[PDB]
Amino acid sequence: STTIQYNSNYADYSISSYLREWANNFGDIDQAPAETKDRGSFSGSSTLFSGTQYAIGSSHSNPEGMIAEGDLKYSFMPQHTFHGQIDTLQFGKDLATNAGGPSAGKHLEKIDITFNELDLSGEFDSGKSMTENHQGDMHKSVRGLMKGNPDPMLEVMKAKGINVDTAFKDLSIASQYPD
């Protein structure tokens, strides 16, 4: 089952109210100056467009970041589809590069919310249209977030049985990180 750990400072937020605020501070990547644009960084397979970790900070010089872990793949040109399976999704601020450099992964210095066993997946077929491939849950939810829009991620979570309006302290699948 999907479970959540959250920082106590977010006890009164819901998943929806947390992602509203994270997404507006992250900002839309398509609106960002090409000089501060962070498209994200894959690590784990010593390659550029796949790996076991995908980490992305804000393109609008704000501290907000997001990290996904699983079996992660990105088709780049021409359909630009993120697919595979996300097992862990983590939100917070202050995205730092591990001592081994970008190829050794990144970590959030301030961790706000972690989804465990998210089972967020999507498939990619080069023989289909970009619009069909862009219907995969994984793709549309992460892409929405990159664009400052949390609504597709929230729709995915509702369809999985998660109430995105319940406060974290009242959510039966959520545990606070220890003081």
Binding mask 104-143 for ligand HEM (x = CB under 6 A): -----------------------------------x--xx
Q: Which residue is nearest to ligand HEM (CB)?
A: 80
Under a CB-based contact definition with an 8 Å cutoff, are residues 74 and 143 in contact?
Answer: no
What's the length of the chain? 179
10, interface contact from Cl ion, ligand HEM, none, CB < 5-8 Å by kind: none
| Rounded-to-integer distance, Cα 95 and Cα 110, Å | 8
Closest separation in Å from C-beta 132 to ligand HEM: 14
What residue 143 binds from ligand HEM, Cl ion, none (CB within 5 to 8 A, per partner kind)? ligand HEM
User: Where along the sequence are the contacts to ligand HEM (CB under 6 A)?
Assistant: 39-42, 74, 77, 80, 82, 139, 142-143, 146
User: Where along the sequence are the contacts to Cl ion (CB under 5 A)?
Assistant: 39
